[PDB]
Paper text:
Psl, a polymeric pentasaccharide composed of mannose, rhamnose, and glucose, is produced during the early stages of biofilm formation, serving as a protective barrier against antibiotics and the immune system. The Psl biosynthesis gene cluster, besides encoding various glycosyltransferases, also includes an endoglycosidase, PslG. Here, we show, by activity-based protein profiling, structural studies on enzyme–inhibitor complexes, and defined substrate processing, that PslG is not, as previously suggested, an endo-β-mannosidase but instead a retaining endo-β-glucosidase. PslG was classified as a CAZY glycoside hydrolase (GH) 39 enzyme based on its amino acid sequence (CAZy) and its 3-D structure had been solved. This GH39 family is made up of retaining glycosidases acting on a variety of substrates including β-glucosides, β-galactosides and β-xylosides.
To this end, we obtained X-ray structures of PslG complexed with pentasaccharidic cyclophellitol 20, the most potent inhibitor. We attempted to cocrystallize 20 with PslG and unexpectedly succeeded using batch crystallization. Crystals formed in an Eppendorf tube containing a mixture of 100 μL PslG (10.7 mg/mL in 20 mM MES, pH 6.0, 50 mM NaCl) and 10 μL 20 (20 mM in water) after incubation at room temperature for 1 day, followed by storage at 4 °C (see Supporting Information for experimental details).These crystals yielded a structure at a resolution of 1.55 Å with 20 reacted with Glu276 (the postulated nucleophile) and with Glu165 (the postulated acid–base) positioned nearby. The −1 to −3 subsite sugars are bound in a cavity in the active site, while the −4 and −5 subsite mannose sugars lie at the exterior face of the protein molecule. Atypically, compared to many oligosaccharide binding sites in glycoside hydrolases, there is just a single aromatic stacking interaction with 20 which is between the reacted cyclophellitol and Phe319. The −2 and −4 subsite sugars form single hydrogen bonds to amino acid side chains (Tyr114 and Gln134 respectively), while the other sugar moieties are tethered by several hydrogen bonding interactions: the epoxide-opened cyclophellitol to Arg331, Asp332 and Asn164, mannose (−3) to Asp133, His81 and Gln134, and the α-1,2-linked mannose (−5) to Asp83 and Arg84. As can be seen, trisaccharidic cyclophellitol 18 and tetrasaccharidic cyclophellitol 19 block ABP 4 labeling after 1 h preincubation at 500 μM to 1 mM final concentration, whereas pentasaccharidic cyclophellitol 20 blocks labeling at 8 μM final concentration. Of these, the pentasaccharidic inhibitor proved by far the most potent in a competitive ABPP comparison. This pentasaccharide motif likely resembles the natural substrate recognized by PslG, in the negative subsites.
Author numbering: 31 to 442
Amino acid sequence: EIQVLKAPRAVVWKDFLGVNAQFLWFSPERYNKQIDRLQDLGLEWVRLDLHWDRLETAEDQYQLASLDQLVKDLEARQLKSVFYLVGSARFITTAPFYSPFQDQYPPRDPEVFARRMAMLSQRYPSVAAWQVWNEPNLIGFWRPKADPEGYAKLLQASTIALRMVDPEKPVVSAGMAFFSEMPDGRTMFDALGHLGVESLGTIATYHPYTQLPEGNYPWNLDFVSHANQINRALRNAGVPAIWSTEWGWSAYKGPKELQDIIGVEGQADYVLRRLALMSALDYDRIFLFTLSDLDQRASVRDRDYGLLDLDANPKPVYLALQRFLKVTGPKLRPADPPVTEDLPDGSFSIGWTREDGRNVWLFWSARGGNVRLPKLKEATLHDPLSGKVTPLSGSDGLEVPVKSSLQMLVWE
Ligand SMILES: [Cl-]
Ligand SMILES: [Cl-]
Ligand SMILES: [Cl-]
Ligand code: NA
């Protein structure tokens, strides 16, 4: 089946597309270079992970110097930042004494956590938004079992405390892993909705990782229909906004751990296809995982999600995204695809207009092939993975080659 998408509203990349960042893993010199590369894309939103057991190493004993300096740097570079705090400090963890995962258990008292998020927000008034925990539907962030009621109480205490510091500042709920599914078969969004958590007015967000850009398996590319369903449900619950705070693929060589091996070229291809989908769905903002490759402190797979390598230099995905954003320009308005004949089965098709008024068609199909555009005499085809630019012309319609990877047709 062909999947045509039309976005609900205009997209301004600087407002819409941010990146995750692990700036505290790096020297200031190195993270400022990563920031140079982010600004060269015309982007400014970053999402930073903070781990409570690294910030408060004993009760009321903190390690804030490097975060203090980072916040000043982010403000000086004019980035907009969302910070999330996750994990329990050792003095407050519900972990049993013998657990090797002390910070992966929730706090014994949600108010203690809430006070720390208020202290951070007070200390760092430049931060644009504050996010409460991460992926509480996943065992690795909330042991020993997912607990909707416990997360709801943590989110409520945190939302109250953050709003006391700054009643106007957004409060972002935890990014839910996947589409919020839990091991017990419920979904965290459904369970929190039954608890009335929409009454807190926090931003909703999830991390819809799928093996391929458009779904998990070639015979079931249901990303778009699944995202549409979740997003309509969140809208229907009255959420203020929907973000996706984490999505992406690793270029790692293996061994395979959950994600199939796709390499640097697969990373570039997949990120561009997924971006083309998510920017045409009902998200207010999304954050690619992640700005930089990571060293051996990260898992083998987690080392290679970067736009940038360890030296803060572009990987193929960065160069491809850069070519894509140069073709689109800074702002796209929803539009319709050109009229086609014989578009291949399984194609994806998305139309936009750029700031110069020209049309951009984003399209691909697993089966490749060709498509006829009967009503055009001129258009330019751009392959963002290779940099190839092809002027196409015909007296009676164009023929356009279709690839498994994204291409961009620009036409009047
Ligand atoms: Cl941290
Ligand atoms: Cl896990
Ligand atoms: Cl047309
Ligand atoms: Na297909």
